[PDB]
Structures are given as structure tokens and as C-alpha cells.
């Protein structure tokens, strides 16, 4: 959830 | 084939160079005075904490500490992940759950790279908090601390440095076997290659080394048993710690975790 912001960032 | 292994071993290395602005070269020369900036400040007791603490109980205030230390950390690795070649392809829930057990394992081996026997660098390099000091913390915080020093000391050892733990750090990350994965074998596939370069890196870097590689792999399976023993010490804290919460990103990572 906040991995998957931190995953999908660029 | 070999050109492609190191190639492989040199993307990861600029890769970690890119995500983690600390490496162990810079600390070790920190630990060893070979450098030419100001010696860190010692944290050893209570009031020498309040002066450093300028550059709510103390054991509380560590923790709390520690937190901010810790998610900064897990978006280093995280962002460091995402270039390890085929990780970003993965279906996304097994990104989360390579991530989510395998964080903690990587910020545990770093953090050897900031420690000696007698104690850890702190904020940047800037400080350094005593073993002794983290030792004498109050139940259960004082337990804290000093499975990572006996890990670190020994993990030290075998003195491996940013170029091999670039590869060891992407073999953890790449763990076919964490609980709940979607897709197992394009997971061991990128895993089984990056083993290979790892093999390779360690012949060619420390060719006098005995079975490092069989070593390393080992201290592998040892960071489960380090993440395992500090959880079990969280789960006390939430059951008899009550006035201090965990940071929301470091709640999401534990949550569920096995
Ligand atoms: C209790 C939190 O434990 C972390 C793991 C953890 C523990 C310890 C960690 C780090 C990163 C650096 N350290 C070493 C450390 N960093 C600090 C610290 C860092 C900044 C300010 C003050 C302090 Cl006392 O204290 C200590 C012991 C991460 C977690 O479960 O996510």
C-alpha cells in the first residue's frame, strides 16, 4: 500500500 | 556466461552506489580514522545521548530513533530492487512480498556494515552509540540490539565489501520461498542468476577465501532467525508498550509478516 507507492515510483 | 555475470555484478554495484549514498568503504574508514572529517560524536551514556541528541524515556527515545533510520532504509532498498534486472516485470503483490520479508534481512546486513565490536554509527556516519550503552537499555529494549552486533561481528569476518554485497543483497531480495508468493519460478530463475554471479564475484575478488561462498549463503539463512527474534521483541512492545506506536510504513511491513 505504501510499499506499492514506493514500488511504482519513478 | 561470464562477461554477462560481471556485467551483472557491475550493474548492481552502480546500482547500490546510486541507493545507498553510505557504503561500507566510507564507513570503515569512519571506524578506522582514515578519513580527514571530524571523528563522530560518542554516545556512551545518558547526558553524552543529550549532547549528541542536538547534532520521554531514553530506551523509548532510541526506538523511536531507530524508526525513521528504518524507513528511510526501506526506501533505499526498495529503490535499489528496482534495478535488479526482471524485479519491476514481477507481478506487484510479489514485489510487496519480496519486499516485506525480505527489507529488514537487507537493513540488518548494512548495519553490519556500520558496526565494530564496540558499537554502531549513527545519523550518517555523524555518530556512534556504544554496544555497551544499547546493552544497558531497560527490558525489553536493552535485547534489541545486540543480536545484530554478534551477527555483525562474525558477518565482518569474512570481509566482503560494496561490490559483493550488491550481489548477496539481490539474492536475498530474489527468495523463491517467502510465504505467499504468486509466481515462484520467474522469482528463482532471476534468483538462480544472480547466485551465479555471486559465485563468480567472490572467486575473482577473494580467490583465497575458503568456501566463502558456501559461507555467505549460510549468513543468509541466519538474518531470518535476526528479523525473527526482533519481531517477537515488537510483539512485546505492542503488548506492554503501550504509549509509543511504530511508523505506519513499518506497521505495513510487520503486519502479517509470517
Ligand atoms: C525499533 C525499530 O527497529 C527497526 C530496525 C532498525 C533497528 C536499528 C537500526 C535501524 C537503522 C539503523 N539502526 C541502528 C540505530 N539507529 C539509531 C538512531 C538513529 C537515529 C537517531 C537516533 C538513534 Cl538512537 O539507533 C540505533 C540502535 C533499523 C525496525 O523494526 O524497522
Given at each position: 500500500?505504501?510499499?506499492?507507492?514506493?514500488?511504482?515510483?519513478? | 556466461?561470464?562477461?554477462?555475470?560481471?556485467?551483472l555484478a557491475?550493474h548492481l554495484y552502480?546500482s547500490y552506489?546510486?541507493?545507498?549514498?553510505?557504503?561500507?568503504?566510507?564507513?570503515?574508514?569512519?571506524?578506522?580514522?582514515?578519513?580527514?572529517?571530524?571523528?563522530?560524536?560518542?554516545?556512551?551514556?545518558?547526558?553524552?545521548?543529550?549532547?549528541?541528541?542536538?547534532?520521554?524515556?531514553?530506551?523509548?527515545?532510541?526506538?523511536?530513533?531507530?524508526?525513521?533510520?528504518?524507513?528511510?532504509?526501506?526506501?533505499?532498498?526498495?529503490?535499489?530492487?528496482?534495478?535488479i534486472?526482471?524485479?519491476?516485470?514481477?507481478?506487484?503483490?510479489?514485489?510487496?512480498?519480496?519486499?516485506?520479508?525480505?527489507?529488514?534481512?537487507?537493513?540488518?546486513?548494512?548495519?553490519?556494515?556500520?558496526?565494530?565490536?564496540?558499537?554502531?554509527?549513527?545519523?550518517?556516519?555523524?555518530?556512534?552509540?556504544?554496544?555497551?550503552?544499547?546493552?544497558?537499555?531497560?527490558?525489553?529494549?536493552?535485547?534489541?540490539?545486540?543480536?545484530?552486533?554478534?551477527?555483525?561481528?562474525?558477518?565482518?569476518?569474512?570481509?566482503?565489501?560494496?561490490?559483493?554485497?550488491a550481489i548477496?543483497?539481490a539474492?536475498?531480495?530474489?527468495?523463491?520461498?517467502?510465504?505467499?508468493?504468486?509466481?515462484?519460478?520467474?522469482?528463482?530463475?532471476?534468483?538462480?542468476?544472480?547466485?551465479?554471479?555471486?559465485?563468480?564475484?567472490?572467486?575473482?575478488?577473494?580467490?583465497?577465501?575458503?568456501?566463502?561462498?558456501?559461507?555467505?549463503?549460510?549468513?543468509?539463512?541466519?538474518?531470518?532467525?535476526?528479523?525473527?527474534?526482533?519481531?517477537?521483541?515488537?510483539?512485546?512492545?505492542?503488548?506492554?508498550?503501550?504509549?509509543?506506536?511504530?511508523?505506519?510504513?513499518?506497521?505495513?511491513?510487520?503486519?502479517?509478516?509470517?
Amino acid at each position: 500500500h505504501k510499499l506499492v507507492q514506493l514500488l511504482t515510483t519513478t | 556466461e561470464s562477461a554477462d555475470l560481471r556485467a551483472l555484478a557491475k550493474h548492481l554495484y552502480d546500482s547500490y552506489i546510486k541507493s545507498f549514498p553510505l557504503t561500507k568503504a566510507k564507513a570503515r574508514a569512519i571506524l578506522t580514522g582514515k578519513t580527514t572529517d571530524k571523528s563522530p560524536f560518542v554516545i556512551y551514556d545518558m547526558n553524552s545521548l543529550m549532547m549528541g541528541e542536538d547534532k520521554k524515556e531514553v530506551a523509548i527515545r532510541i526506538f523511536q530513533g531507530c524508526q525513521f533510520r528504518s524507513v528511510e532504509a526501506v526506501q533505499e532498498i526498495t529503490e535499489y530492487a528496482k534495478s535488479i534486472p526482471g524485479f519491476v516485470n514481477l507481478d506487484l503483490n510479489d514485489q510487496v512480498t519480496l519486499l516485506k520479508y525480505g527489507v529488514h534481512e537487507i537493513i540488518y546486513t548494512m548495519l553490519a556494515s556500520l558496526m565494530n565490536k564496540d558499537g554502531v554509527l549513527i545519523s550518517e556516519g555523524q555518530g556512534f552509540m556504544t554496544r555497551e550503552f544499547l546493552k544497558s537499555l531497560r527490558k525489553p529494549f536493552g535485547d534489541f540490539m545486540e543480536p545484530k552486533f554478534e551477527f555483525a561481528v562474525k558477518f565482518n569476518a569474512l570481509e566482503l565489501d560494496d561490490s559483493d554485497l550488491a550481489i548477496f543483497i539481490a539474492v536475498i531480495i530474489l527468495s523463491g520461498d517467502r510465504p505467499g508468493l504468486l509466481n515462484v519460478k520467474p522469482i528463482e530463475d532471476i534468483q538462480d542468476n544472480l547466485l551465479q554471479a555471486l559465485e563468480l564475484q567472490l572467486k575473482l575478488n577473494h580467490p583465497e577465501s575458503s568456501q566463502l561462498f558456501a559461507k555467505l549463503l549460510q549468513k543468509m539463512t541466519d538474518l531470518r532467525q535476526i528479523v525473527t527474534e526482533h519481531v517477537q521483541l515488537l510483539q512485546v512492545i505492542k503488548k506492554t508498550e503501550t504509549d509509543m506506536s511504530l511508523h505506519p510504513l513499518l506497521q505495513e511491513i510487520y503486519k502479517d509478516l509470517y
